[PDB]
Write a protein that binds this ligand. Structure first.
Ligand SMILES: Nc1nc2c(ncn2[C@@H]2O[C@H](COP(=O)(O)OP(=O)(O)O)[C@@H](O)[C@H]2O)c(=O)[nH]1
Ligand SMILES: [Mg+2]
Ligand SMILES: [Mg+2]
Ligand SMILES: [Mg+2]
Lengths: 167, 184
């Protein structure tokens, strides 16, 4: 039902009501491609080392390796990203989990609208539980994707999760 | 315990005054800014202490692409219209609900009728009557609250301050009761 508004640059935005002090503060409070996805992290209390992907290049090094994870552990996924020039409207995160060729999950979150800024943004998912049991160990293939209201295609990368008895 | 509240709704339905009355306890009669600076009010509800962060917004079409930056990490939304403007109420399901649900899935909405004090104002009734309309009625408000899946429907006047502390007590109760967990 929601219908995205007309594209508007940050300058077109500042030009509007530019003599209104109160709106000037509003815009101040709230404010290479435009959106750059930089890092994927696994936030996990029980993990013996840091679990991170750099996504600023070399996207051809998964599926060669993965994140190892002890079966049954709680964790969140933290994606970092950068907005460089203009507003991204209503950015969405979509995830498809594969096991042995079968799609076992699909999940997607409204991350939101974000203006350009120096420091990267960090988006944290809700808590998830690593699989367990004799039949659920080894590798899961994961297809991560971003999209937004001005774009009907995606930023896509693909990563692996390998579930073990031990860390 | 931090919660974030964002107040949305049509231009001139009384968003800003509501917010100012809540922090200052005085209706502004001299000057009303277009958007009041966000600020942090220390409220207590149901035997519990709450750091409540309040964001006013710009309702205009022109800021449709700007305003949605206020939403990330929002815990409760005050979605207003004015009791003296059945148009402002028609836009609830035509604009504010499609937007708020789009950017804030799973987030409780309190539908808020502003300017109660105009329900029975003489001059007001005439103006509305001159375009074949009357003030909005509580049933029309509550009906809408059900139609859009609002946690509640509250009515208020920031002029007389009746209902103001109760609106935000409800929003705060909504936030404690309640896509993606956190953005930083
Ligand atoms: N009569 C009456 N007028 C109000 C009330 N609240 C706001 N207003 C008036 O309606 C107009 C718009 O208010 P404002 O708070 O600036 O609305 P916003 O643009 O939606 O934030 C102003 O002239 C206010 O004085 C109210 O409770 N009663
Ligand atoms: Mg950035
Ligand atoms: Mg205003
Ligand atoms: Mg304070």
């Amino acid at each position: 039902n929601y219908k995205p508004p007309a594209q508007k640059s940050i300058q077109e935005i500042q030009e509007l009501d530019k003599d209104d002090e109160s709106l000037r503060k509003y815009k101040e409070a709230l404010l290479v491609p435009n959106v750059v996805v930089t890092r994927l992290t696994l936030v996990c209390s029980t993990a013996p080392g840091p679990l991170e992907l750099d996504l600023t290049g070399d996207l051809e090094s998964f599926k060669k390796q993965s994140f190892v994870l002890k079966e049954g552990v709680e964790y969140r996924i933290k994606i970092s990203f950068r907005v460089n020039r203009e507003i991204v409207s209503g950015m969405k995160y979509i995830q498809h989990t594969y096991r042995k060729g079968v799609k076992i999950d699909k999940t997607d979150y409204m991350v939101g609208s974000y203006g350009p800024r120096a420091e990267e943004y960090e988006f944290l998912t809700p808590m998830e539980e690593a699989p367990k049991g004799m039949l659920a160990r080894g590798s899961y293939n994961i297809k991560s994707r971003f999209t937004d209201d001005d774009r009907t295609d995606h930023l896509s990368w693909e990563w692996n999760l390998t579930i073990k008895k031990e860390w | 315990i931090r919660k974030k509240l964002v107040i949305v709704g049509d231009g001139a339905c009384g968003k800003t005054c509501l917010l100012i009355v809540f922090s200052k306890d005085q209706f502004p009669e001299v000057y009303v800014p277009t958007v009041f600076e966000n600020y942090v009010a220390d409220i207590e509800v149901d035997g519990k202490q709450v750091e409540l962060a309040l964001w006013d917004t710009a309702g205009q079409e022109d800021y449709d692409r700007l305003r949605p930056l206020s939403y990330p990490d929002t815990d409760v939304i005050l979605m207003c219209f004015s009791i003296d403007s059945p148009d402002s109420l028609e836009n609830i399901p035509e604009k504010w609900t499609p937007e708020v649900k789009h950017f804030c899935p799973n987030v409780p909405i309190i539908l808020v009728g502003n300017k109660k004090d105009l329900r029975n104002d003489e001059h007001t009734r005439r103006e509305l009557a001159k375009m074949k309309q009357e003030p909005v009625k509580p049933e029309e408000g509550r009906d809408m609250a059900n139609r859009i899946g609002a946690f509640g429907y509250m009515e208020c006047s920031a002029k007389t301050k009746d209902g103001v502390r109760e609106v935000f007590e409800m929003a705060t109760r909504a936030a404690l009761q309640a896509s993606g967990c956190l953005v930083l």
